């Protein structure tokens, strides 16, 4: 089974509170309390518990004095993490009297309320085609240079995977291994469609979840890259203007939906300052 943590996103609200996406973490070994360390610093007075199936949650009282199982921590808990802007290292330590201490590592990102995100599907959009693997999937040409320059202009790349949770760590390794003419894929969180995280329209629900951790009065999702018409629908209903949605096919032809224009990652990169203007 899966052992790891799905990249976590945290957003600082303009009242200085903190909101985050749900924590999806699994201890594959453990067949129990859970402590946290952020940036190699243990976090005091914060703990998680674990269900029989291995999924973990923050215990939180409701108004009837019953324990609720939250995947999203309170703002007060998140402030104790002492998160820096951007990437942060996070580890979860599950202590068990039978199996001792078990540790998993992951990534947690802190954005501001005015941070602008650029979504990118993985399969068919980064890879050329949409269980046996080696990471040698083919990659559309010139995509690493394009995304690098989007990031350099102040946007934040956010990747989207609909593969089963078993492949999550593989997808992370595939993206960080891409090298094209010296360019690499900019570091960023990989969100997992909630249908793949079973416990107790999916791409659209995930992106609306991400949008809703930002205040209502800003539109945080600037643009999106996909390869199926359902990717365009997911982005539109999460707040992306049609003009900023790009849909690529297996011949690496990119359609800019708003302008109904045929293009490519190379040509979009040449027009980077027009389509992805630099942010202050």
Give the binding site for Mg ion (CB under 5 A): 121, 123-124, 130, 227
Please identify, using beta-carbon distances, which residue of 55 and 192 lies nearer to Mg ion: 192
Contacts of 179 (CB under 8 A, 6+ apart): 144
> Rounded to the nearest whole angstrom, what is the least distance from the CB of residue 162 to Mg ion in the complex?
7
Cα–Cα distance measured from residue 95 to residue 25, given in angstroms and rounded to the nearest whole number: 15
Please identify, using beta-carbon distances, which residue of 114 and 250 lies nearer to Mg ion: 250
Contacts of 198 (CB under 8 A, 6+ apart): none
Sheet holding 8-12: strands in order across?
18-20, 8-12, 100-112, 86-96, 33-38, 48-50, 56-61, 67-70
Contacts of 219 (CB under 8 A, 6+ apart): 239
> Rounded to the nearest whole angstrom, what is the least distance from the CB of residue 20 to Mg ion in the complex?
26
Please identify, using beta-carbon distances, which residue of 12 and 128 lies nearer to Mg ion: 128
Please identify, using beta-carbon distances, which residue of 123 and 193 lies nearer to Mg ion: 123
Cα–Cα distance measured from residue 278 to residue 212, given in angstroms and rounded to the nearest whole number: 24
Cα–Cα distance measured from residue 72 to residue 92, given in angstroms and rounded to the nearest whole number: 15
Please identify, using beta-carbon distances, which residue of 124 and 220 lies nearer to Mg ion: 124
> Rounded to the nearest whole angstrom, what is the least distance from the CB of residue 233 to Mg ion in the complex?
13
> Rounded to the nearest whole angstrom, what is the least distance from the CB of residue 76 to Mg ion in the complex?
38
> Rounded to the nearest whole angstrom, what is the least distance from the CB of residue 45 to Mg ion in the complex?
42
Cα–Cα distance measured from residue 232 to residue 257, given in angstroms and rounded to the nearest whole number: 8
Name the residue number minimizing CB distance to Mg ion. Answer: 124
């Amino acid at each position: 089974s899966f052992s790891g943590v799905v990249d976590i996103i945290v957003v600082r609200q303009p009242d200085d509170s903190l909101k985050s996406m749900p924590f999806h973490i699994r201890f594959g070994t453990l067949k129990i309390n859970i402590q946290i360390t952020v940036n190699d610093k243990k976090i005091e007075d914060v703990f998680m518990l674990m269900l029989p199936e291995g999924a973990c949650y923050f215990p939180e009282l409701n108004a009837k004095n019953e324990i609720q199982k939250k995947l999203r921590p309170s703002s007060a808990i998140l402030k104790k993490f002492n998160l820096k802007n951007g990437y942060n290292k996070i580890q979860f330590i599950a202590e068990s009297d039978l199996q001792g201490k078990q540790l998993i590592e992951g990534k947690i990102y802190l954005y501001n309320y005015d941070t602008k995100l650029v979504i990118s599907d993985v399969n068919g959009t980064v890879t050329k085609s949409d269980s046996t693997i080696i990471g040698k999937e083919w990659t559309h040409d010139d995509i690493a240079e394009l995304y690098t320059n989007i990031q350099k202009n102040g946007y934040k790349m956010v990747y989207l995977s609909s593969r089963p949770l078993y492949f999550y760590n593989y997808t992370q390794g595939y993206l960080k291994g891409i090298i094209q003419n010296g360019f690499t894929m900019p570091d960023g969180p990989i969100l997992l469609s909630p249908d793949q995280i079973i416990s107790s329209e999916f791409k659209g629900a995930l992106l609306k979840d991400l949008r809703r951790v930002f205040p209502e009065e800003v539109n945080p999702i600037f643009a999106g890259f996909g390869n199926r018409d359902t990717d365009a629908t997911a982005c539109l209903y999460a707040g992306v203007i049609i003009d900023n949605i790009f849909i690529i096919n297996e011949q690496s032809q990119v359609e800019i939906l708003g302008k109904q224009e045929k293009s490519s990652y190379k040509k979009i990169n040449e027009k980077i300052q027009e389509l992805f203007p630099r942010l202050p």
